[PDB]
Amino acid sequence: IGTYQEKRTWFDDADDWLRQDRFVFVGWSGLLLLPCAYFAVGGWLTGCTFVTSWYTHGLASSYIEGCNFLTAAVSTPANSLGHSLLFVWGPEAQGDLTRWFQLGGLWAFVALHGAFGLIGFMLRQFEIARSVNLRPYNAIAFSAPIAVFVSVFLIYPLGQSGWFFAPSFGVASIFRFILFFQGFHNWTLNPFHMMGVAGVLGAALLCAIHGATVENTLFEDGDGANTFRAFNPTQAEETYSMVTANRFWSQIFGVAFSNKRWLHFFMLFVPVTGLWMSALGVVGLALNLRAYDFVSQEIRAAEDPEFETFYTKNILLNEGIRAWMAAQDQPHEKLTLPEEVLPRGNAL
Amino acid sequence: PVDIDGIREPVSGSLLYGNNIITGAVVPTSNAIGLHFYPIWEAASLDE
Amino acid sequence: GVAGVFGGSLFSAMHGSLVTSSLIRETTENESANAGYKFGQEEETYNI
Amino acid sequence: RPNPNKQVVELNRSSLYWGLLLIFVLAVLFSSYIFN
Amino acid sequence: VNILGLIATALFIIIPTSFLLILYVKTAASE
């Protein structure tokens, strides 16, 4: 390669073929991305269409059962299976494909194929960036979604008693996961979801602000009222006035960007940091190291029967969520709670 | 503390009344007020 | 709204990463690349 | 004889403001939990 | 947390702030 190219090998032929610029770039990463991602998406669609969760969660979660796009979901397996990988040949299904669907093995199938698909997609980003000679900042950015997926769908269930407490792949199932986190972990009070919320909201703010500011500081460059036509892809001059934007935001907001590179690095930086902080918080929750309570306020409320804050009300709400969701959310517990032990307000 | 729900059960939201930054808040207006306009000069005293 | 904030984060990261990667070499090593851009550069410093 | 790899660290005022803001915002966020 | 948390917060405020201020002063004096 460096001193000389030696002779062409079969690896060279494979590389030349895979690296062709066809409509769908496959590349070397394609051999891992395309099968894994295809099987993950197809498994999700088959599960949301035909597979049920009657034996896993005692819930109907497919189209053929009468569920719609919102309520259908590839539910996670039963809690008694623990963290079993649920191979279709494993000691649980023992080869029975239909029963493997019934036991919930489709969830493990989809999760593992999706994880390897995400690995393959970041590899694809690296390969494509190397092909066109660009600094692979987008793969570094995509590390954040991979961290979120790993911490939520893999680390968190492994920290708990089994895959049962993982997010089931679906809309309403994800909403159930969110409300479960609020009720049990008090996830809103956790400073890491706080940093994640700040990162995501700031990223949306930056997206909107940058788009609007660019679209409202454009140079004329044309005579039509449609400003989109007055742009050439190969032009060298900037299409919008950086000086005007800087002055405007300096006089409106107080501070303003003066460096395009720094501006776009900040746009890249904010959401990635937010998602990584949220991922660390989710790891902490996986270990049940939850920021549930402020012990000083609990002690003061216990001693003082008239001290109340919004935090105590949130604690009461969490208690209600846990008590009223435990019986049906976790069937393996077999919680036959009589109606007199469920916490409840007045006349409600 | 502010009687947010109008049930004579005040809620403390200021730092001086045993709150931190996370729990501290400016409690919404009393439920007894409803949508009524409540300026300072309407109240009998600053305490109310 | 959730799709909007998630898309805002996604598109912000995507656009920022693309612009930072396409940033043409005007500054070598041993210092930050931000020195390559000037406030009055009045030119595209990145290969679109 | 002197090490050629010697370099001087720099910190412009915008970076100083960003660092101070980060430190104080982190302190604001985590002080409630530290005091618990 | 009456004192230990107070010391932790005070150090977290003081150490990085002193580091940043020293770096900025050195930069402004050199250039």
């Binding site: 000086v243 800087n246 300096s250 107080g254 501070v255 303003a256 003066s258 | 730092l15 001086l16 931190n20 930054i21 501290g24 | 000037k38 406030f39 009055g40 550069q41 | 412009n12 005022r13 915008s14 403001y17 101070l20 803001l21 104080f24 915002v25 302190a27 604001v28 002080s31 409630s32 005091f35 | 009456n2 107070l6 917060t9 405020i13």
Partner: peptide, 30 residues
Amino acid sequence: MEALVYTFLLIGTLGIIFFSIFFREPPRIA
């Protein structure tokens, strides 16, 4: 005493904002 610490932290953040607004380094054109 916790209230004193919280107030000091908020005052520090606001002062940093004030300095970053009114004592910023001028944006140097070119």
